[PDB]
Every structure is written in structure tokens, then in C-alpha cells.
Chains A and B, each alone.
With several copies, the nearest count.
Chain A
Amino acid sequence: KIPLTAVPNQAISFNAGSSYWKIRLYQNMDMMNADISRDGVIVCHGVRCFGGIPLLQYSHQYRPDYGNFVFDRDADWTLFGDGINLFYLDGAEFAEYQALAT
């Protein structure tokens, strides 16, 4: 999981899957938005937060062997830390889940 809190605009820094990650979440009008950078170099920007649909969309981004992040429901900064979670999944289970998505 990802330890989160109920702030309209925030950032997280952690080491996941033998690599360094930095996620910042910010409200943008109706829906939440995120910017992802791995080991100091940005990957994708302005990705909408939706339940289930992974934040990293692209094979050259999410992994040759890295992981990915998935929301259980639609994001809402009021509910963070209370009934809503963000989950990091490494390569194996993420590949399995992606195959299941079909």
C-alpha cells in the first residue's frame, strides 16, 4: 500500500521494487491528478486518477521489470487514509492482473 493523508495537494517519497519513487497528488478541478518520477527523472504527468486503471499506461514506462500503481476506487482527497487505498504491485502480479483485465 501507500501511507496517505487527506490533503488537497501532497507528495510521497519511497523506495519500491528496488528503485526510488516520488509521487505527488494534487486536486485539479473535478478529479485528482498525479505526476510520477522514478529516480529523479519524470515518467508521465497529469495522469487522471481512476479506480483500477493503472497510473502508468505505457510498456516502456511501467516496466520491463518494474511495478505499477493502482487505485481501488475513484480518488478523493477527503477520503484518503479513511477507506480508500493506493496499492503498488510488482512485475509478476501486475502482469497477471493486466492479463485478467481482458
Chain B
Amino acid sequence: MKKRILRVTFNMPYGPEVIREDLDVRVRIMKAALRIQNRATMEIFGLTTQLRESLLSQFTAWKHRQRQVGREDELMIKVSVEAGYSDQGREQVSRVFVGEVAIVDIISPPPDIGIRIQCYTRQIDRTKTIRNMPPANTTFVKFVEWGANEMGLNFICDTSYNDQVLKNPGRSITVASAILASIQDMYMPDVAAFVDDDILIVKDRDKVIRPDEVTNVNSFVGIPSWSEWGVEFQCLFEPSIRVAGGVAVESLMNPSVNGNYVITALEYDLASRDRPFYIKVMGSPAA
């Protein structure tokens, strides 16, 4: 009888602080192929006075250390989420989200004090500015490369628009976050630009990033159905599912929807002491 695994890590100044699965933790994650950054809402129950003092005081949202030696971690702390199963002590954990805390709350009163937390991916860029002059007259791919270097992310770009000359592409960008909006703006809607985990991905709409890593899916909790753009279904926690990856679908109740699809949006509903432990997938026909 396999057990579920859910760890949440915080990179506090003294070191990591990992909330294990033994407590009551609920997490909802939404990811899509857009410029709007990913989000994660976290429910944490049973925190003692010691851990409340240690953690809740560091999501200040004011600024200390006006001299500002360095950047990044001297503004807001980072959170990483990994979920998976465990059988006979043999694990299959996988990472699903990286971000920084933005909003704090208190949800449930005593006797069980619970808090709610909002995290966003690459929110550190909303404060960091641009100190490297954007290219003046260049092609698309070099603009993408400059943006990737400026943000500090490994990038992959594969578009049919890779040999098109742009004039003054980024001469009106004030911070590091509008780079992505610039990249997406030029060639909507065929070109989709998004940031996933730590990788900036720019691609055509209907191209699978990794053609040889197609995950075959044949066991659906949520019956597949046509949904105006392709297919949409639901399953248990499958670590293989990613964004922009491909899926091969074979059904029983709905055998007319079999085919290859490219993943557009995802949703995670993972709990350690509640029923939901799911993944919702929407896809588009492969080109």
C-alpha cells in the first residue's frame, strides 16, 4: 500500500527548513504557457509557536538593509515543492514548483492555527532592474538570448521566426519582468513564451519540445472529453507530465479521441490528509 510524499522547503538565512508530509499541508498549483507567472496557494496546519516565530516574520514585504549588499535572497525568501509516492521505502519524488512568498494570512482560529501563503515564480525580477543595454538592430533569437542572460535563466528557443530582423525591440523596458511580455507580444498567438521552473521556453504553439519523451497515458480518473481546443482530462500524480510536452492517449469509454496532444495548461491539487491528489491536463493537437 503505497504512501504519498509531500515536502515543502524554505531557504531561510540559517539554512533549509523542510515541512514533511506528516503534518496537514494542502497545495494548489496552476501553470500555463503564458507570460503571467505561476501561482501556488499553500495551507499549513499545526505550526507551533517556535516555527510560527521562525517563519511568519520573514515575509515582511518592507525593505531592510538600505545599503543592499547583493540582491535576490536579501529581499524575499524562496520556496521549493516536491511531491511523489513511496513504496517499500523506495521513493519516486519529483519537483513541481519554485517560487517566492508574496502574501500571508491566517485562516483557522485555535485550537488548530492554520495559515495561507501565496507564492509566485520569478517574482525576484519585479524589483531587479536592467543594467545591460538591449540590442539595437538584431534578429529574434539574439533578443531571446539577451533576455535569458539578463534574467539569469537557461533558455531554449525553437521557432519558425528565428531569422526575422527587429528594430528597437526592448528600448522601453523598466524592470526585468517586462522582458517576457516583450518576447510574447511580437508574434502572438503562434509564438508562446513562458518561464517554467528555471527555464525560459519560446516555441511555436504546436511543437513538442522533446519529441522522444512522449508519455503514453491510458489510465484516467477524469474521463477524457473534447474541449473546444483539443482534449482535457485528469489523472493521479504522474511525475512524467510537464508543460509543452507530448502525450499519447488511449481511451476506453471515449475511443474516438485517441491521438497525440501537446500540453498547454496544468493544475495540481495535492494534499497529505485529504482526498485530492490529482493533475488536470489540457492539450492541443500535435503538428
Which residues of A approach B to under 8 Å, CB–CB?
Answer: 5, 11, 13, 15, 18-20, 22, 37, 39-41
Contact = CB atoms under 8 A, between A and B. Distances in A.
B64 A40 contact: no
Nearest to B66: A18
A20 B64 contact: yes
Interface residues of B, number: 15
Contacts of A18: 154
A40 B74 contact: yes
Interface of B: 13-14, 64-65, 67, 69-70, 73-74, 90, 154, 210-213
Contacts of B211: 40
Contacts of A13: 213
Contact of B154 (A5, A15, A40): A15
B213 A41 contact: no
Contacts of A22: 13, 213
Contacts of B67: 39
12 contacts: A11-B14, A15-B65, A18-B154, A19-B65, A22-B13, A39-B67, A40-B13, A40-B69, A40-B70, A40-B212, A40-B213, A41-B69
Given A15-B154, A18-B154, A37 B64 contact: no
Contacts of A37: 212
Contacts of B69: 39-41
B215 to A, nearest CB: 12
A15 to B, nearest CB: 5
B70 A5 contact: no
B51 to A, nearest CB: 14
Contacts of B90: 5
Q: Which 4 A-B pairs have the closest CB atoms?
A: A20-B65, A39-B69, A20-B64, A15-B64
Given A5-B90, A37-B212, A40-B70, 16 more contacts: A11-B14, A15-B64, A15-B65, A15-B154, A18-B154, A19-B65, A20-B64, A20-B65, A22-B13, A39-B65, A39-B67, A40-B13, A40-B65, A40-B69, A40-B73, A40-B210
